[PDB]
Design a protein around this ligand. Structure first.
Ligand SMILES: COc1ccccc1[C@H](NC(=O)OC(C)(C)C)C(=O)N1CCC[C@H](C(N)=O)C1
Ligand SMILES: [Zn+2]
Length: 139
């Protein structure tokens, strides 16, 4: 679990969005596993606007942060789950790092700000949904 809070927006994994997120929907994209909802309070986070390929992510299943080298956002095949059919997930970055069911929502950060959130994983891999291209989150 986890979310990014920037301005009057809350960014979460679309498969973990609540009834309240959907009732305050701003934008969602199933192909990216992202959903953004509106908030009444001002958020605590800031978004990176960069091309970093290194950073640090929070791993809830270890209560620890780990450094990672990750691939640029791209279209990556993701196996079926209860949440989605087998499909290509877009804007996904992969890295070698621990993740397991329940780690979605952990933030990946570089020196410039928030890069994205955990969205997939498996067998010593961790995948992050990028948010750096969502320029409108900043206004
Ligand atoms: C962080 O996700 C990890 C990490 C390691 C191993 C497995 C997983 C997840 N698998 C998982 O939860 O499987 C269950 C439901 C328990 C059968 C995973 O990769 N998902 C599930 C949630 C939706 C994700 C997506 N963006 O399509 C893909
Ligand atoms: Zn950066």
């Amino acid at each position: 679990s986890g979310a990014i809070y920037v301005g009057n927006y809350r960014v979460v994994n679309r498969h973990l969005a609540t009834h309240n997120d959907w009732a305050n929907l701003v934008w969602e994209d199933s192909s990216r596993d992202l959903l953004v909802s509106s908030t009444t309070a001002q958020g605590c986070d800031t978004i990176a606007r960069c091309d970093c390929q290194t950073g640090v992510y929070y791993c809830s299943s270890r209560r620890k942060h780990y450094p990672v080298s990750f691939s640029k956002p791209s279209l990556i095949f993701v196996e079926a789950s209860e949440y989605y059919p087998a499909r290509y997930q877009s804007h996904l970055m992969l890295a070698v790092g621990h993740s397991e069911p329940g780690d979605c929502g952990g933030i990946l950060r570089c020196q410039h700000g928030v890069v994205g959130i955990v969205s997939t994983g498996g067998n010593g891999l961790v995948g992050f949904a990028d948010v750096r291209d969502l320029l409108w989150l900043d206004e």
